């Protein structure tokens, strides 16, 4: 199952 990576961290700055 997907693991929290730098793309997830970065994506959570949008909206």
């Amino acid at each position: 199952l997907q693991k929290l990576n730098s793309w997830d961290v970065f994506g959570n700055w949008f909206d």
Epitope: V9, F10, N12, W13, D15
Partner: antibody
């Protein structure tokens, strides 16, 4: 800055669903934070349960619980929530909400915590 | 994924001491290690993150070091209110594993 207030029942019977809610002040739910749930069974250490991205809504769950855990958020009510279904005696624990601060590409840590709710699973 | 161990599991130290406790990760976690203090009956308090960054509001006598697998928390000028359980944590990816905790008692 951010302060967290937890709410929920102290007693749940086995096979029922446990729901907890955390109310946030000093910041929006919709933010780069990861809103988090942690528990501590009696006599044991701390166990991360899961989180939700304040802006993206992406959720991550501890593999020992993921089929029974759901984390959700409501920005207009300044809250985020935990649902633990099919509770058993082993889910007896103190449950905490927390704020996991973020950088741009890596995370910081759990810098703000609710006060804890003591949850007992029993008939 | 990540297994976290701490050593010693408990110790006593005297007021004025400079005490070091350790944490080890089963895999390289770079510097993404945090340290918490937990008082009996209370939520934990963050002391250190990124292995050596002191959190705002924490007393200057707490410090951390290490990178990779081996880390340490050092409490200088130990104070009587510093009794607690201390936990390390991998704080950059799931399942954000906490160590088992180290219980510190004050000797008198």
């Amino acid at each position: 800055q951010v302060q967290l207030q937890e709410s929920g029942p102290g007693l749940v019977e086995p096979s029922e669903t446990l729901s907890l809610t955390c109310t946030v002040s000093g910041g929006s739910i919709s933010s780069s934070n990861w809103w988090t749930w942690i528990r501590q069974p009696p006599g044991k250490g701390l166990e991360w349960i899961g989180n939700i991205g304040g802006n993206s809504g992406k959720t991550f769950y501890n593999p020992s619980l993921k089929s029974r855990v759901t984390i959700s958020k409501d920005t207009s009510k300044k809250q985020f929530s935990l649902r633990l279904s099919s509770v058993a005696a082993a889910d007896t624990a103190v449950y905490y909400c927390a704020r996991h601060s973020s950088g741009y590409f890596t995370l910081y840590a759990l810098d703000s915590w609710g006060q804890g709710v003591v949850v007992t699973v029993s008939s | 994924d990540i297994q976290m161990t701490q050593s010693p599991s408990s110790l006593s130290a005297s007021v004025g001491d400079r005490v070091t406790i350790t944490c080890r990760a089963s895999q390289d976690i770079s510097y993404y290690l945090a340290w918490y203090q937990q008082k009996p009956g209370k939520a934990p308090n963050l002391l250190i993150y990124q292995a050596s960054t002191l959190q705002g509001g924490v007393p200057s006598r707490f410090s951390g070091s290490g990178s990779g697998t081996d880390f340490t928390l050092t409490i200088s000028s130990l104070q009587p209110e510093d009794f607690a359980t201390y936990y390390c944590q991998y704080h950059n990816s799931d399942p954000f594993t906490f160590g088992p905790g180290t219980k510190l008692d004050i000797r008198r």
